């Protein structure tokens, strides 16, 4: 649309302030696509994924690598 707006794959044009803002506003998540690396109050998985701090040692696998339930990081 306008040069001050970002167009997603759904044909909906959102504001440029909503691009890389940490929240998904388009139905395909294209506003959060690419962007830059976000610094992670949040647990960091071994492959770089960021999860909430209450997800660590919750008894369920949340990382793609499964780093949350690893015995090296989570101590019994």
């Amino acid at each position: 649309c306008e040069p001050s707006q970002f167009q997603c794959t759904n044909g909906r044009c959102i504001t440029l302030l909503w691009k890389c803002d940490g929240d998904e506003d388009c139905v395909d998540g294209s506003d959060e696509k690419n962007c830059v690396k976000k610094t992670c109050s949040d647990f960091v998985c071994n492959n770089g994924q960021c999860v909430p701090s209450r997800w660590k040692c919750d008894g369920d696998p949340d990382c793609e690598d499964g780093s949350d339930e690893s015995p090296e990081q989570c101590h019994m």
Binding site: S4, T15, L16, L17
Partner: protein, 307 residues
């Protein structure tokens, strides 16, 4: 052709007219320029001290380097939290890099940078008219939650961006007085512990040399009549008017001016819609407004009576 290594680049002492003691002195922090052309009120200040780098020149955030007052001069190292910025009240700091800093300030008539709560304890103030500028056709103290979202240009908080460059030159002689000693009717020069010094001296004739110990020179009496300055100072220094130019003033380097003025989208207030009333050949607009708001009318004909 621009480098950002900063190992080959050093701070310096500057002369700004209003020190901490309300008289012009030499300070390790000296404001050369203030740029205030950002729509969000953030200003960019050039300071003779380097920010974000340690004594050795390695990029170390939250640490700044500066020239010292001692005559065996070196480049001392201190914490960034001691740097305070104020125009009329305290300024919030947004970014720092070598010679440059970006800060959000209230309106005022002068801009000062100080090193508070330290061994130095120095301040430098310059005259700069900072006014509360706004975007659009309606004034606002703060941007609204919801508005029109018009284009406006602000300084980028990231230090990776560049808005031009500053030229960097090799430094000239400094000629410290403590490298002289006038005992009886003869003059001596004492270099520091190990460092070589260069003297050029005109007791009766111009004779120059490089020494590393206390040496006699001719038979002249007064210590005014010659000097001594250390050589091998090949660290690039900004071409500030407070420094003597070297014999070779070729531009040895260029360094970026950070915090580029980039276009973003920022909200501006939408005023109350005026309650228009109509008569035979005109309209009255009621125009409720709190802050000043621009009303512009023009006729759609040959003679556009623009008000």
């Amino acid at each position: 052709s621009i480098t950002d290594d900063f190992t080959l680049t050093s701070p310096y002492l500057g002369f700004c007219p209003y020190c901490r003691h309300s008289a012009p002195c030499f300070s390790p922090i000296k404001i050369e320029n203030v740029w205030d052309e950002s729509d969000d009120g953030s200003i960019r200040i050039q300071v003779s001290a380097q920010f974000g780098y340690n004594q050795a020149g390695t990029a170390d955030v939250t640490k700044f380097r500066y020239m010292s007052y001692d005559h065996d001069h070196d480049i001392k190292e201190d914490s960034m939290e001691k740097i305070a910025i104020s125009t009329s009240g305290p300024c919030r700091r947004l970014g720092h890099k070598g010679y440059f800093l970006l800060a959000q300030c209230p309106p005022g008539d002068s801009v000062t940078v100080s090193i508070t709560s330290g061994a130095s304890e120095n301040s430098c103030t310059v005259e700069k008219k900072i006014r509360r500028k706004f975007v659009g056709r309606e004034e606002y103290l703060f941007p609204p939650v919801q508005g029109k979202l018009v284009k406006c240009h602000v300084y980028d908080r990231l230090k990776e961006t560049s808005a031009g460059y500053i030229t960097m030159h090799r430094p000239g002689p400094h000629a410290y007085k403590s490298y002289l000693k006038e005992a009886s009717g003869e003059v001596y020069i004492k270099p520091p512990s190990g460092k070589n010094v260069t003297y050029e001296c005109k007791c009766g004739d111009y004779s120059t040399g490089i020494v590393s110990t206390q040496t006699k020179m001719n038979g002249c009496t007064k210590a005014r009549q010659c000097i001594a300055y250390k050589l091998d100072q090949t660290k690039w220094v900004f071409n500030s008017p407070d420094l003597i130019r070297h014999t070779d003033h070729s531009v040895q380097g260029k360094l970026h001016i950070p915090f580029r003025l980039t276009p973003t989208v920022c909200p501006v207030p939408l005023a109350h819609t005026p309650t228009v009333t109509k008569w035979f050949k005109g309209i009255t607009l009621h125009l409720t407004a709190t802050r000043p708001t621009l009303l512009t009318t023009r006729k759609l004909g040959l003679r556009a009576d623009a008000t």
